[PDB]
Design a protein around this ligand. Structure first.
Ligand code: GDP
Ligand code: CA
Length: 307
């Protein structure tokens, strides 16, 4: 055996910027892979592994808003993509839908990951409405192709970022908020793999919840004090940036981490928050971790599928 190998793959411009920001944030025990047609951008990537696709197609330029070029680029470079993926137990593919490279290449990358045996999760954005109808239609086709290629898919409509900014919030700060969805999803899985919990969840439970499902939610909530478990649970399933909310989820992996004070009653409260918000008879895979380093803080991690 071995400790489950996680890789995060950015595809196209937005995907590679997300990768750069995650690397800078400080994510460890995860392999980052940068994939792009655009050689200028790739040269500035902080990823250990860089794959320039479509060298013969684009000659180092981007795909110029043509998803067919992105797709053919990924197909041209299938063997480099396979080699980069090799060894992964789980692959996260992140990309902004609507352009030429991500829209076409990301679903090929996802297909390669899955056909190689990796549990494959996509986290992708839809374009802002101000970008126009063609962009939205191209992105929609990209989303549908991603859905057909991944085990689970998380979609972030960029329009939702307009819900969390004020008129002065810098664009890059809004982009960082979107980054949180993938980054915390990855970190929650990394944490599950690395610690043997008092009620343990491991990579086999992640596979059960995420394999061949469709839409997904991945969230984390942290709270302290009086109603900390309910508050943390509510935060975990809060989805202002998510196309897919908790509502309708029929399978949930939920892990609760706390100090020695973590109460049985609290654990039930948190479970009930998730079950009630889903408004379904949820099949739960429940975990608990006692970290005595923690004091009054409680952390609730949720992965929801089965929509
Ligand atoms: N949230 C977010 N969205 C992005 C970012 N970069 C690009 N986008 C979105 O992604 C779409 C495609 O852009 P890009 O990834 O550069 O295109 P590509 O390189 O040709 O695949 C754009 O239409 C934007 O909606 C980013 O850093 N954050
Ligand atoms: Ca564990």
């Amino acid at each position: 055996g071995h400790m489950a190998t996680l890789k995060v793959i950015g595809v196209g411009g937005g995907g590679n910027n997300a990768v750069n920001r995650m690397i800078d944030h400080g994510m460890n025990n995860v392999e980052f892979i940068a994939i792009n047609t655009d050689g200028q951008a790739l040269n500035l990537s902080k990823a250990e592994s860089k794959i320039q696709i479509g060298e013969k197609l684009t000659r180092g330029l981007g795909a110029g808003a043509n998803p067919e070029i992105g797709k053919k680029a990924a197909e041209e470079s299938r063997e480099q993509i396979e080699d980069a993926i090799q060894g992964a137990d789980m692959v996260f593919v992140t990309s902004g839908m609507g352009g030429g490279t991500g829209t076409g290449a990301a679903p090929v990358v996802a297909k390669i990951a899955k056909e190689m045996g990796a549990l494959t999760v996509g986290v992708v954005t839809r374009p802002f409405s101000f970008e126009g109808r063609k962009r939205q239609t191209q992105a929609a086709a990209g989303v549908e192709a991603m859905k057909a290629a991944v085990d689970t898919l998380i979609v972030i409509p960029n329009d939702r970022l307009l819900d969390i900014v004020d008129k002065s919030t810098p664009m890059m700060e809004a982009f960082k908020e979107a980054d949180n969805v993938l980054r915390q999803g990855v970190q929650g899985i990394s944490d599950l793999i690395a610690v043997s919990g008092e009620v343990n969840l491991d990579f086999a439970d992640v596979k059960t919840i995420m394999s061949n499902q469709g839409s997904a939610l991945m969230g984390i909530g942290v709270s302290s004090g009086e109603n900390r478990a309910v508050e943390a649970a509510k935060k975990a399933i809060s989805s202002p940036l998510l196309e897919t909310s908790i509502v309708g989820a029929q399978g949930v992996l939920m892990n609760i981490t706390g100090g020695e004070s973590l109460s049985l009653f609290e654990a039930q409260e948190a479970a009930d928050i998730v079950q009630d918000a889903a408004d379904e008879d949820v099949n739960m895979i429940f975990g608990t971790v006692i970290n005595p380093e923690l004091q009054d803080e409680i952390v609730v991690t949720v992965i929801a599928t089965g929509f």
